[PDB]
Amino acid sequence: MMAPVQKQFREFHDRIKLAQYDENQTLRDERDAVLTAVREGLKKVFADRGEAAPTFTPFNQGSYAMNTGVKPLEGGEYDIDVGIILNIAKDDHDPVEVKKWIRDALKDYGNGAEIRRSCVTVFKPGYHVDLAVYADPELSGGTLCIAKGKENSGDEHRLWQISDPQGFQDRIASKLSGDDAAQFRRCIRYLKRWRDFRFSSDGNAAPLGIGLTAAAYWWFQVSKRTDPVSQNVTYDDRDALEQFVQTMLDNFHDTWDSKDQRSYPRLTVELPVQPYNDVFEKMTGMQMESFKSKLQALLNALKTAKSRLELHDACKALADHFGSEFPVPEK
Ligand SMILES: Nc1ncnc2c1ncn2[C@@H]1O[C@H](COP(=O)(O)OP(=O)(O)OP(=O)(O)O)[C@@H](O)[C@H]1O
Ligand SMILES: O=c1ccn([C@@H]2O[C@H](COP(=O)(O)OP(=O)(O)OP(=O)(O)O)[C@@H](O)[C@H]2O)c(=O)[nH]1
Ligand SMILES: [Mg+2]
Ligand SMILES: [Mg+2]
C-alpha cells in the first residue's frame, strides 16, 4: 500500500516543481534573449578595440539544467543559470576584465547588469540571469576556468579558477536512474521550498540550493517498498526526507571560533568535482546554528507526520515547514 502521506508529498511536488530547460520554452526564450543581448553588446564593446568580438559557447547550468528547479514564492525571481565559454586564453586576460566585457555588453539590457565574484548577473522583471564566464580550455592549457573576482575584490581574490559545472551536473543526473532519481530530485525540490519558506526573513542566512543539491548527492538514500505479491513499487518521500535530513544533521560539527570564543555547528559540503570547495563556506557560524535548528525542527515534523492518527494533523505538521503549497486534507 501507499506510504502514509505520499500522495500529499507528490501533490506538493506538482505544485512547486518548475520544468527544466528542455521542457520549458519560456525559460529557453529568456535565456536566449540574454545570450543574443551579450552577442550584440560584445560587438559594441569591441567596436573601440579595433577587432571582432570574441565568440563564446553557451551551456545550461544550475537547477534548470539539472531538473531540480522550483517555482519562486510570490514576489521572488526565477534564476536562469548559464555558462559562456569565451574563445580566449585565460593567461592573456584578467578575469574581472572579461566579466566587465560581459557586463558592459548588457549595460542597457533590462534593469541592468553587474559583476559578481562568480558571474555577471543581468536583471529582468521577475527573473535574473547569472552568466558564469569561462575561458576556452583549448587556449588555456586544457582546463575550464571560471572568472572569479570583482573590482572591489582587490588583487588576491581575482583569478581564473578551475571549474567543472558540467561534471557536477553529470554527477547529479547519474547518481541514480528512473524513479529512484525522480525521488532524489523531488527531495531536493522539497528542501528548496523549505529554504524559501523558512529563510525568508534573512535571505543571506539561507542554505543555498546548490548546497542542498550537493548534500543530496552525498547523503540522499532512496526509500521505497516492493509489494511481496505484485512486486508493485511505492516510494516513501517522507521517510526518504527523514533519513536525508537526519544524515545532514549528523554531519554538523562544532567548530571553534577564537574571535567569539565559542563553537558554532557547521555543515561542510564539498563539491564532488573541481574545485571541491565547501559550498556552505560563506554561511556564518550563527547562520549555521539557525540552519541546524530549523533542520532539526523539520526532522521532528517529519517524524511527527509518521505517527499522526489523522492525516490532517500529519499534513499540517509538514505544512508548518513547507508552506502554503503543502496540501492539508480536512479532518
Ligand atoms: N558555492 C558554489 N560552489 C560551487 N559551484 C557553485 C556554487 N554556487 C553555484 N555553483 C554552480 O553554479 C550553478 C548555479 O548556482 P545556483 O546557486 O543557481 O544553484 P542551482 O543549482 O541553480 O540551485 P537554485 O535552484 O537554488 O538556483 C550550480 O549548479 C553550480 O554548478
Ligand atoms: O562556481 C560557481 C559559482 C557561482 N556560479 C554562479 O554565480 C551565481 C552567484 O554565486 P553566489 O551566490 O555564491 O555569489 P558570488 O560568488 O557571485 O559572490 P557575491 O557577488 O554575491 O559577493 C551563482 O548563483 C551561480 O549561478 C557559478 O556558475 N559557478
Ligand atoms: Mg540556480
Ligand atoms: Mg544563480
3-state secondary structure 130-189: EEEEEECHHHCCCCCEEEECCCCCCCCCCEEEECCHHHHHHHHHHCCCHHHHHHHHHHHH
- The response to whether residue 168 sits with its C-beta less than 6 Å from ligand 1 reads yes
How far apart CA 197 and CA 135 sit, in angstroms, is 37
- Ligand 3 centre and the CA of 95: distance in Å? 22
Say if residue 63 carries a ligand binding annotation.
yes
Nearest one of 101, 61, 62 to 83, comparing CA atoms: 61
How far apart CA 114 and CA 220 sit, in angstroms, is 35
**Alpha-carbon distances of 253 from 258, 263, 289, rounded to whole Å:** 16, 9, 11
- The response to whether residue 273 sits with its C-beta less than 6 Å from ligand 2 reads no
Distance in angstroms between the alpha carbons of the first and the last residue of the chain: 22
**Alpha-carbon distances of 45 from 15, 151, 265, 331, rounded to whole Å:** 43, 18, 47, 63
What is the C-alpha radius of gyration for the chain, rounded to an integer number of angstroms?
22
Choosing among 3.30.70.100, 3.40.50.300, 3.30.460.90, 3.30.565.10, the CATH entry for 21-163 is: 3.30.460.90
Q: Are strands 252-257 and 262-267 parallel, antiparallel or unpaired?
A: antiparallel
**Biggest distance spanned by C-alpha atoms of the chain:** 75
How far apart CA 61 and CA 252 sit, in angstroms, is 28
How far apart CA 320 and CA 331 sit, in angstroms, is 16
How far apart CA 139 and CA 141 sit, in angstroms, is 6
Say if residue 239 carries a ligand binding annotation.
no
Residues in Cβ contact with 209 at an 8 Å cutoff, skipping those fewer than 6 apart: 63, 68, 188, 192, 195
> What cell does 263 get?
563553537
- Ligand 2 centre and the CA of 132: distance in Å? 8
- The response to whether residue 117 sits with its C-beta less than 6 Å from ligand 2 reads yes
Say if residue 224 carries a ligand binding annotation.
no
- The response to whether residue 63 sits with its C-beta less than 6 Å from ligand 2 reads no
SS3 track for the chain:
CCCCCHHHHHHHHHHHECCCHHHCHHHHHHHHHHHHHHHHHHHHHHHCCCCCCCCEEEEECHHHHHCCCECCCCCCCEEEEEEEEECCCHHHCCHHHHHHHHHHHCCCCCCEEEEECCEEEEEECCEEEEEEEEECHHHCCCCCEEEECCCCCCCCCCEEEECCHHHHHHHHHHCCCHHHHHHHHHHHHHHHHHHHHHCCCCHHHCCCHHHHHHHHHHHCCCCEEECCCCCCEEECHHHHHHHHHHHHHHCEEEEEECCCCEEEEEECCECCCCCCCECCCCCCHHHHHHHHHHHHHHHHHHHHHHHCCCHHHHHHHHHHHHCCCCCCCCC
How far apart CA 236 and CA 244 sit, in angstroms, is 12
- Ligand 4 centre and the CA of 331: distance in Å? 41
How far apart CA 219 and CA 188 sit, in angstroms, is 11
Say if residue 91 carries a ligand binding annotation.
no
How many C-beta atoms lie closer than 10 Å to residue 128's C-beta?
Answer: 18
The letter for the amino acid at 54 is P
The atom number, within ligand 1, closest to the CA of 192 reads 26
How far apart CA 123 and CA 125 sit, in angstroms, is 7
Say if residue 257 carries a ligand binding annotation.
no
How far apart CA 65 and CA 18 sit, in angstroms, is 11
How far apart CA 24 and CA 40 sit, in angstroms, is 25
Q: Contact at 8 Å (CB) between 234 and 1?
A: yes
Say if residue 124 carries a ligand binding annotation.
no
Q: Phi, psi at residue 162, to the nearest 5°?
A: -60, 135
- Domain chopping of the chain, boundaries: 21-163, 168-322
Resolution (A): 2.0
How many C-beta atoms lie closer than 10 Å to residue 22's C-beta?
Answer: 12
> What cell does 154 get?
582587490
How far apart CA 173 and CA 150 sit, in angstroms, is 32
Find out whether the peptide bond into 54 is cis, omega within 30 degrees of 0: no
Q: Are strands 78-86 and 56-60 parallel, antiparallel or unpaired?
A: antiparallel
How many Cα neighbours within 13 Å face the side chain of 303? 10
Degrees to nearest 5, angle at CA 291 with 288 and 296:
125
How far apart CA 140 and CA 87 sit, in angstroms, is 10
- The response to whether residue 8 sits with its C-beta less than 6 Å from ligand 1 reads no
Method used to obtain the model: X-ray
- The response to whether residue 149 sits with its C-beta less than 6 Å from ligand 2 reads no
The atom number, within ligand 1, closest to the CA of 281 reads 1
- The response to whether residue 165 sits with its C-beta less than 6 Å from ligand 1 reads yes
Q: Contact at 8 Å (CB) between 153 and 282?
A: no
Nearest residue CA, atom 11 of ligand 2?
A: 118
Residue 50's Cβ-count burial label (10 Å; 0-12, 13-18, 19+) is exposed
Q: Contact at 8 Å (CB) between 150 and 195?
A: no
How far apart CA 183 and CA 220 sit, in angstroms, is 10
- Ligand 1 centre and the CA of 83: distance in Å? 11
For the four alpha carbons of 159, 160, 161 and 166, in that order, the dihedral sign comes to positive
How far apart CA 37 and CA 149 sit, in angstroms, is 23
